Amino acid sequence: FDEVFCGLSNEERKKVYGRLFGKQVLAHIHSRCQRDADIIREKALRRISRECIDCALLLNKMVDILQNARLTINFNAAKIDFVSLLKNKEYLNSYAPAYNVGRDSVETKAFELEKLADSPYAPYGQTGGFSVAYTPNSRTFSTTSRPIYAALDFLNGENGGASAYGKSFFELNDNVKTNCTFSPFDIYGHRFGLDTSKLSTFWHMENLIASCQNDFFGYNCFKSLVKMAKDEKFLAHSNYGKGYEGNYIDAHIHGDVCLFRDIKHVYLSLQENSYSKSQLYDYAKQINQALNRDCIILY
Amino acid sequence: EMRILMVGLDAAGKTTILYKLKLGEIVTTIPTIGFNVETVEYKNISFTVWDVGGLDKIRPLWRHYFQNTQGLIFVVDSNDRERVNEAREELMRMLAEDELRDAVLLVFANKQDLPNAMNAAEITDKLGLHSLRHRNWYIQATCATSGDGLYEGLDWLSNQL
């Protein structure tokens, strides 16, 4: 076998070791949710009876809605060149920028990354501090070790799940959600408070339901998910997805996102774009005929 | 390019087979909560292998990829005699999918280094491969630790392309 094996360049080994670290982060959060599965369900049923019948049936309906929701990554087509982004054949987080240092600290405290210090892939998921240029000191720190952020658009927003970052958005395939951790608030906000117990996986949406917001003004997440489970149609609040703390369910994709392999649709905004109508229609028709899918959707 | 869905019972050796082909190493046991995906270049062919942790509870989420699923690698623990029939039932459910009727099936009789492991013939008899019709299949005795049989199965997939 060893005779036939070609080998791997260090930059490729570095990416794989990072992805293996990220899968351990997800497995760490999933084990946390399996440990607290009873108290989470009891807390979720407590909230359902507090609002509203067989709470077990209503909870299952809300879990099936959140699981069958679409995963969106919003962007501003007028401020970034989506053409340069699509040609990269891969989506990358911010580690590939003085905010990264704080983002590393948030990710280290939110995902309990210090609990993986004894892992054989820890040297590839630890920045080892940041240099003067806000770059990691560790020469082995891999971009793939940190998640790609998205939003769980369970209401099918007109401009995606987090329109605060642009009117355009990628829609990822549903299987990508199985590699995601979920939070009721953006993990970089004060309402999240670096609370690891607020993180759930794709198989423990009951934690997301018991921890989501029930604000008395503005967009209400709990009441929206409850009414959608009761087969009531309604227009989502005008601030759905706008606002980092509590106005969207933050998702963390632990794994790489390739274009267009992990992409179901790309909704390019016509009114917010650096390209003209004729140019955007050409890009859509060109990419669609090349993939034999309806990936690029202008709107 | 060839798209491969690597499925099978847990603890069979799916993740180990994937990253032994990718890294040449034996990765530590990482419970596959979601799924792993790696591209392996072999004989000028780019195998994109999706290591699905357990689609037993998420069948509709992966039917998007079934239409472009060119190969199915089913890994079975050749030492787990108490669960070999369980693997057969899961294999039958994977073969009864209409969107996978044109895909090839490669069975990996994994963990052959263990003393009580069944050979490829005994696994072929317990899974019922000889009773299959209109399915281009093949079974290979493999050991993800040492790496034996891994490239033999990849050679078979390359020929079916």
Ligand SMILES: NC(=O)c1ccc[n+]([C@@H]2O[C@H](COP(=O)([O-])OP(=O)(O)OC[C@H]3O[C@@H](n4cnc5c(N)ncnc54)[C@H](O)[C@@H]3O)[C@@H](O)[C@H]2O)c1
């Ligand atoms: N954007 C969303 O949809 C979304 C969803 C939920 C939460 N959030 C939160 O918002 C924060 C900031 O979001 P944001 O979108 O303003 O910044 P970001 O964190 O997405 O910044 C990354 C930047 O790199 C660009 N990029 C991606 N792949 C690239 C590649 N291959 N080559 C070059 N550039 C590439 C992205 O388009 C973006 O401009 C996130 O860190 C997250 O905490 C965002």
Ligand SMILES: Nc1nc2c(ncn2[C@@H]2O[C@H](COP(=O)(O)OP(=O)(O)O)[C@@H](O)[C@H]2O)c(=O)[nH]1
């Ligand atoms: N002896 C032996 N052990 C193996 C082999 N392949 C996997 N294992 C063991 O099986 C355990 C878990 O296997 P895993 O890759 O997680 O299987 P999966 O869950 O189906 O992906 C690991 O601890 C390995 O040591 C093999 O070919 N031989």
Ligand SMILES: [Mg+2]
């Ligand atoms: Mg597994």
